Design a protein around this ligand. Sequence first.
Ligand SMILES: Cc1ncc(COP(=O)(O)O)c(CN)c1O
Ligand SMILES: Cc1ncc(COP(=O)(O)O)c(CN)c1O
Ligand SMILES: Nc1cccc(C(=O)O)c1
Lengths: 426, 426
Amino acid sequence: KTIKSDEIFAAAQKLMPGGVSSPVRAFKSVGGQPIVFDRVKDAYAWDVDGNRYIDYVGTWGPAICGHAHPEVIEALKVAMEKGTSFGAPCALENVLAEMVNDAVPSIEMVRFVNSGTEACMAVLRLMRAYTGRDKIIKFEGCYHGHADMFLVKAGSGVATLGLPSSPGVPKKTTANTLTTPYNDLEAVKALFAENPGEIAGVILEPIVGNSGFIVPDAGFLEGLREITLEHDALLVFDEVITGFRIAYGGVQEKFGVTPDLTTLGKIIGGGLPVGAYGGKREIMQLVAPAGPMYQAGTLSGNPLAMTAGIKTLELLRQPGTYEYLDQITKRLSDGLLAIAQETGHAACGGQVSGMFGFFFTEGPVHNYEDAKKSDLQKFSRFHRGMLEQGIYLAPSQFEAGFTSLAHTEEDIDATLAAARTVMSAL
Amino acid sequence: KTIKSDEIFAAAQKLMPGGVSSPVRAFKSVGGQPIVFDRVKDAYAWDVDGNRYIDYVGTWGPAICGHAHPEVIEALKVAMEKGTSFGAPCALENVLAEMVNDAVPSIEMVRFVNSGTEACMAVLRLMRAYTGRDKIIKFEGCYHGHADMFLVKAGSGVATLGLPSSPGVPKKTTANTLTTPYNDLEAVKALFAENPGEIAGVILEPIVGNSGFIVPDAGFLEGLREITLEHDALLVFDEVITGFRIAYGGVQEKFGVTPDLTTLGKIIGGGLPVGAYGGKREIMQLVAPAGPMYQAGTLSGNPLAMTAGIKTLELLRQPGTYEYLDQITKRLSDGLLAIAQETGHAACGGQVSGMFGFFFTEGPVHNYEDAKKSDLQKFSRFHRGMLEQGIYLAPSQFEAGFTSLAHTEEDIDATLAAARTVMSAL
Ligand SMILES: Cc1ncc(COP(=O)(O)O)c(CN)c1O
Ligand SMILES: Cc1ncc(COP(=O)(O)O)c(CN)c1O
Ligand SMILES: Nc1cccc(C(=O)O)c1
């Protein structure tokens, strides 16, 4: 039963567009019956109707240490006694900044913002100001925030319902954005050859999460690194989802490729609204007040967000953190793929650390186009069935799933048991 | 003494651009020595060195009820026990949304975001999508976040730092931003006459705060309302600063002019990162997932921000709230102007509710150009002198000052006494 949710969502539709603060939450691609959360803790989420779920969304990435972690909460209660926002510098900004610099290879200087969208927006402007060029290359199926003159063929909630991008933004403004298929080096080389001295750089999700879970093919990241250097263009990694999840130093640390600039978000805020962008010192020097490129933020670097980020990173620095994530996630992933086979359903997927994907198609999936061959109607029934079995999964075939340090071996087994029950039907 | 601040700021400059998360905190135009806050409460702020100040910045607008208000803090402690972020709908979103709709005249449907920048960015895209036109009119000296099209004749930091239209912004996109001086109706009419059928609408600060405190001349707002209707263009009010401060319903309520869309921020977050944009239902229907215009936000509508906003608005709904603000602020404003006269310094200013301005120039100030005639060197000495006397003012001549419900009659008197001491020197 979802009586209270239906009631609250119905009322919500009269107050907010589509009745949500964010598109993907409306469940448009899986039925249209969203459930309203009341509280979350560890690896679970609870309904406004009392239903308990094993959560695989983790508020979309931030809850890697588990929901309402006791130490994060405790640190927040103590900090807010001093005020939630200053509007002036505080020591905690220095602490988190230093922690981020040590953690992320390419980051020598950082700037805190309030969301991944603000960070990506700032990084685009910075790419152009530093190179003096206007064109940017992005990949189909990737999402870097709703940046006006750039938001085109984005993933996330956009691809959730087959939505393209925009409108609003003029066609002239979006002419400075080039697109190519993810994992396609040749397409990228062609774009440079065809636009000599006009590409500021390339921005991408080192590991895709907004058009399903997609890993880069061998030599793809290395390839992009080489071609950008060859044309004095910048290589920008959007690690808003991957940062601190794939590895403490993100994908750039794990796979050994160092970008010039990287954006961070989610986990770095420990649950609160936070974003960040940084990279080579010579580039960050253009950011005001040090440089001419203007970018500001009233609540940027507020003590509460800083406190939550610091505590979250300290927890991740503990022994066996990423080993545990990889272990339970592989068990979850393989298990799902074994069950699909045993029940006769074509499927593929995979995982790296605490991030996984599962598509209802034989694949393999190398790009957004491949991802779109998935049987969306089957995913819809699968999703509803799992929900009824007490498992909460992203309400979209084009969203990667997430695991946390709070998920236990038993939670995993219970999820597999539920998946067998569900797929046996379908 | 500011030993600890100098030490922390020095280290900060090696970790973050200019050593700050936001340009204005820089103190560039006032000496260069920012003070690092440790805590804030009621109407005061405390140094990392132990110096206590009577705060007139209020973290730039949010702290209208005073810093660390007991009821807001208490409501936050209880709420976070349930988790800081869900990534799914929650009942609290419905509550705040409804409160905002009742409070703001033009708002029939609302969408929550994470900052004023995100709200203004969404509202620009919406203006264009709804009208099918690309050009926008903004005023010199106004600030609507750091979205690209807005970095033209921007106020706030850009003004303070004497920066030009920001670099890294394609000429293509900037070409769609038309500007005009504030309070100049004729200039606005000319822009329409010169661009038939291309203006989506006009966006402005109903009462300016980012190029000093500037009130609209008689008939200016009414004039803009009439010309926009005449050409089927939209009138957009950026009430990120004015919302809930000038009046419960903002400037639109106070001055009787109803826009088509309005952006909110600061106060609505009660100290946490929050933004919002809403207006006529027929326009908000284009926002995804209800409409084609895509705009998302991971932490948008999170329970902690919602809880803080709700509590803050309930406090403001209490009897005598705005009367008290107007009373103590007028007393502060007039007092400052009386002291400048008595000590022989040319000055002008004013206030509306809990928002005031003070310029070192005879004025009057009707626009950004007038504001720039202010003696910045004198302001610099005035600012430092006040700081040494225990009064914390915005580190810029182009930033409006703020008052709170926690400021007492005695705090005001102590500020006037300090101003006499300071201006007697200079
Ligand atoms: C790769 C990437 N970049 C940017 C963002 C924007 O994040 P936020 O909502 O925090 O602005 C997201 C969230 N979908 C993302 O996945
Ligand atoms: C009128 C106005 N609009 C929008 C903003 C952007 O606010 P935020 O820092 O919340 O992005 C500001 C503050 N710079 C503002 O003063
Ligand atoms: N842009 C802008 C406006 C006001 C305050 C701030 C801030 O960092 O405190 C930034």
